[PDB]
Design a protein around this ligand. Structure first.
Ligand code: CNI
Ligand code: CNI
Lengths: 258, 258
């Protein structure tokens, strides 16, 4: 059977090709996860159809309705067979779906406009002159919200109550706020996206300091799926062959503009 | 049943207490993995006995007998229920045992004696004045053996023919060779051990360059074990509570000597 692959439009993982209107099927897409999907399918020996997740989300469970959204939702309600995307391995997601070993490692990091006198999450917590925030929804905001660590707790206390508001609705908006605030706004996001934007024009952004936590992106399958075991081994095979580092280098640095 | 935990004497994961001769059972030992073992057992709700692996090895399929040695061997042949140690997640081990998601992320780094005019792997590859090698077996040597990357291919071509020999049989031997060779020997090893030794007296070593690859240590159980699922969730939970980072900070930097 043709395996249904759910994925998300996030650069440079899955992007629409220049002339995607002319093309059909899996040819419409390109990127890290498009290249990874091809390798995973070749190792496990299956045909696959790429599909973009309906609501354009990763996967979170609502506190009211209890309904899963995003790609996690698409796996648990049987709308897709496998999730090949930068989907963060988390406790609450691992309870409902299975993750492969991480194909990429990452952390929460600090994005600054070049020239900003900040280097550390400690620095940001000790001042206010430079504003800092996260995305208005999802993983990074939840990290600071639930953190019991002193310094991240002090940063959440500030961000809860900052005037003007410091949260942004999209990544693009967070990046634009950093670029246009003349070094007075710092943006907290996934280290992988931070280092990608650092390679985009007009090269005015910079990743600084060490990561605040340690996470991994994994490929997701449903509980008891017949693909889980082979997919897990494929990821390790591809890591030891050096293809995951070669794949990252291609989409982050070879196609880099800085 | 009392869960049999296999582990290895490797600092600072498992170490003999100053007066272990007086103490019995699990009280003889201390370290990162000792503390982690207590946390995993508390979350999963089992009693446990810490046992040091008889042959003092991590685990590899013997060349002649094809029999697994070390901690991997103790899980595969039914001697142990769980391995709590810095056991590198690799394809060949994953084919015979089950791994939790990584509790620690790391890679290959460079150890130099302070003073050595080396800052990266590229610097190393451009010269033949200062010798450099790896452990005589395991993941670090394999990476260089397989690598298609020009710089690492050039480093392997040098290493595999170097005179005198640049490979060492133990970590203690590699570390000692750096300390006794007066800036003429650099040692390639796992980043975690590198940064541990940097905090050890007499404080004459330094970690330089970014990581050359990336891998992880996992908690391991036998295939189809009922303990695997809960242990995996435990590791993720402890990472999200910030405990794995506090344990890292405790044994590396809080107890540091430099
Ligand atoms: N890249 C990336 C990202 C990957 C993400 C993400 C946010 C971002 N991001 O916008 O930076 N949130 C998630 O909950 C997730 O599973 N994976
Ligand atoms: N720490 C550590 C280490 C952990 C290791 C290791 C070597 C080292 N080392 O001494 O550098 N070899 C392995 O095969 C392994 O599974 N885990």
């Amino acid at each position: 059977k043709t395996v249904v692959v759910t994925t998300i439009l996030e650069s440079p993982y899955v992007m629409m090709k220049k002339n995607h209107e002319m093309l059909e099927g899996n040819e419409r897409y390109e990127g890290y996860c498009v290249d990874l999907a091809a390798e995973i399918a070749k190792h496990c020996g299956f045909k696959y159809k790429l599909t973009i997740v309906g609501d354009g989300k990763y996967g979170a469970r609502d506190a009211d309705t209890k309904i899963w959204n995003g790609m996690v939702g698409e796996l648990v309600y049987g709308k897709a067979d496998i999730a090949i995307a930068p989907l963060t391995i988390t406790l609450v997601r691992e309870e409902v779906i299975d993750f492969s070993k991480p194909f990429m490692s990452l952390g929460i990091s600090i994005m600054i406009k070049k020239g900003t006198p900040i280097e550390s999450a400690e620095d940001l917590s000790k001042q206010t002159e430079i504003a800092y925030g996260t995305l208005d929804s999802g993983s990074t905001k939840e990290f600071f919200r639930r953190s019991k660590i002193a310094v991240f707790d002090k940063m959440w206390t500030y961000m809860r109550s900052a005037e003007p508001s410091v949260f942004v609705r999209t990544t693009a908006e967070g990046v634009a706020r950093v670029r246009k605030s003349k070094g007075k706004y710092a943006y907290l996001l996934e280290s992988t996206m931070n280092e990608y934007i650092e390679q985009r024009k007009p090269c005015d952004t910079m990743k600084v300091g060490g990561n605040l936590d340690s996470k991994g992106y994994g490929i997701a399958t449903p509980k008891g799926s017949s693909l889980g075991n082979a997919v897990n081994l494929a990821v390790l095979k591809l890591n030891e062959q050096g293809l995951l580092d070669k794949l990252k280098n291609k989409w982050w640095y070879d196609k880099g503009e800085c």
